[PDB]
Write a structure and sequence with these properties.
- This is part of a larger assembly, with chains A, B and C.
- By secondary structure, chain A is mainly alpha-helical.
- Chain A has one helix at 3-19.
- Helices cover 74% and strands 0% of the residues of chain A.
- Chain A starts with a helix and ends with a helix.
- By secondary structure, chain B is an alpha+beta fold.
- Chain B is built from two helices and four strands; from the N terminus they run ββαββα.
- Chain B has a four-stranded antiparallel β-sheet, with helices on one face.
- Classes of the chains: A mainly alpha, B alpha+beta, C mainly beta.
- Chains A and C meet through α1 of A and α4 and β8 of C.
- The complex binds phosphomethylphosphonic acid guanylate ester, magnesium ion and zinc ion.
- Magnesium ion (MG) is lined by residues 17, 28, 30, 40, 44, 80 of chain C.
- Chain C binds one RNA strand through residues 29, 31-33, 42, 208-215, 221, 224-226, 260, 262, 267, 278-280, 285, 289.
- Chain B: This is Eukaryotic translation initiation factor eIF-1.
Amino acid sequence: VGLPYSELLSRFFNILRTNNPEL
Amino acid sequence: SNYIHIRITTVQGVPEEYDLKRILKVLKKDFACNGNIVKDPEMGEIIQLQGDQRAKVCEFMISQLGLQKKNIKIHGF
Amino acid sequence: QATINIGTIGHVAHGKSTVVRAISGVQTVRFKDELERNITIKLGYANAKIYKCQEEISPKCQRPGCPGRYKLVRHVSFVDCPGHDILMSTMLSGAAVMDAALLLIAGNESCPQPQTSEHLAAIEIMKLKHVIILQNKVDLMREESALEHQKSILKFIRGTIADGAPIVPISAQLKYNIDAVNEFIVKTIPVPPRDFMISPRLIVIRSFDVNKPGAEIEDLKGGVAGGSILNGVFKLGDEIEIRPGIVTIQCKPIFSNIVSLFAEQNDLKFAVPGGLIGVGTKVDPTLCRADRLVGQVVGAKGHLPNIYTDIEINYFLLRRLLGVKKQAKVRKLEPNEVLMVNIGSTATGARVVAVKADMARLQLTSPACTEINEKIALSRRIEKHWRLIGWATIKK
RNA sequence: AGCGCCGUGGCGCAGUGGAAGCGCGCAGGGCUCAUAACCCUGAUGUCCUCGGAUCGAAACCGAGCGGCGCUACCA
Ligand SMILES: Nc1nc2c(ncn2[C@@H]2O[C@H](COP(=O)(O)OP(=O)(O)CP(=O)(O)O)[C@@H](O)[C@H]2O)c(=O)[nH]1
Ligand SMILES: [Mg+2]
Ligand SMILES: [Zn+2]
């Protein structure tokens, strides 16, 4: 089951977009 | 490293993976120029051919061993 | 010190050294002036800090916002092992050393990566099943591409030996979603039973030559080596023997005494097994200079490891070959072919004298010591270099 | 991290222990009807910095500086 992994992936994308909007 | 340059014309920087006298043999006939292998102490080994044929030198270096064509930056001069 | 050994595997040009650097914080030297860019030869090492906050990189917590700090929970070592085709023997040595696994899978590249699957099979060979699938590349994928890769990973890994593999998103640059990695390491992966009951043994995987150049020789240090202990605690003030020993073809044991035991930051007198330790003894540094103490079985005095040349092995092969994107069927072994037979950590290609469908007799050029089981891996010469074909076990 | 080399005139060497060192270069002039060749004059600098001995020092040495070869990451 990879259900609780896509949530952390979404959190990762959110953090990356917040900290580095340039990239 | 292994940088190669051509200066009005001597070729400084030559890989040793093929014998030099055959390089001269093909060079003189495919350029029609006086050819010299000048071995100055501990500089880039000197191969000198007359005339302004840097395009032809590009042709030769492609046809001898060259397959990169990206570290060659011939100074105009 | 270290309680449980953990390792990371991934394909070439994938990224594991920097991933562990974001996990642990210890730089991977990747020395010798040619390993900096293509692949490594010696093993990478790192040490992690696990102080968990139950209302992390540091024993004191300030990032979460609440001034509450974290308490001591775990301190786990990490053994970086290179996932390339050229070197496999050290990979299998570390694989027998490691107890926990972290596999990398690359999204935009070919979803079946041959070395990732090959080393997953190697993991499943040596009784390793607590594996966490990590998507080593996250920022370089779309959301739909990430979903497609998730479904591809799920469909590819359903019926293998490693069934219960949680998935985690990581990168080498961002340093985020890292506490999830530590949390899942603590949760899914328990420390294997390791206490005072079983007799102490050692397995040395690397050679360190310690001779500080330029300094006066009147005060130099001896020979230090990296070792792992599957049973029992080592204490200072004991006589030890490097059993595979020296070549005088025949080999004879080495005897020495312990001088120091570097344990993850310093020199500790005692050390619970389950972690890489730096055993520094009176051995000659030249014996620790080249790749000499790579895969050597070591005994505390009071035990008599047996040196063998002819070994009877129960071996089993899988259906297909591994490590190739053409592939061929697994072919049954033929007599008089040198096949590498790695006894947990050793690196010695044996000759096959007796051939059976599920049994074999193999002779090592260099004799090796056998104590109880010392699980084995089997590699052939097919694709111009060493290719895994199956697994082996000593039975005498 | 150590010991051995490099220490620039756009360049490689050259003496290093009397002070601006050679050729390659580049500019001009000479030669010839003209060109190449040949023959002359030139502007290039902190031979990286610190000191010592030193009438005299870039050099002879020594206590830091930028890169190169090995040890081989030398717990
Ligand atoms: N953007 C990005 N680059 C990565 C990532 N992981 C690795 N890389 C790239 O890998 C290169 C080197 O990473 P490294 O972990 O040291 O290589 P390695 O894992 O030892 C190679 P092998 O697994 O075969 O031993 C870097 O250039 C880096 O940009 C990643 O997650 N994201
Ligand atoms: Mg490494
Ligand atoms: Zn960057």
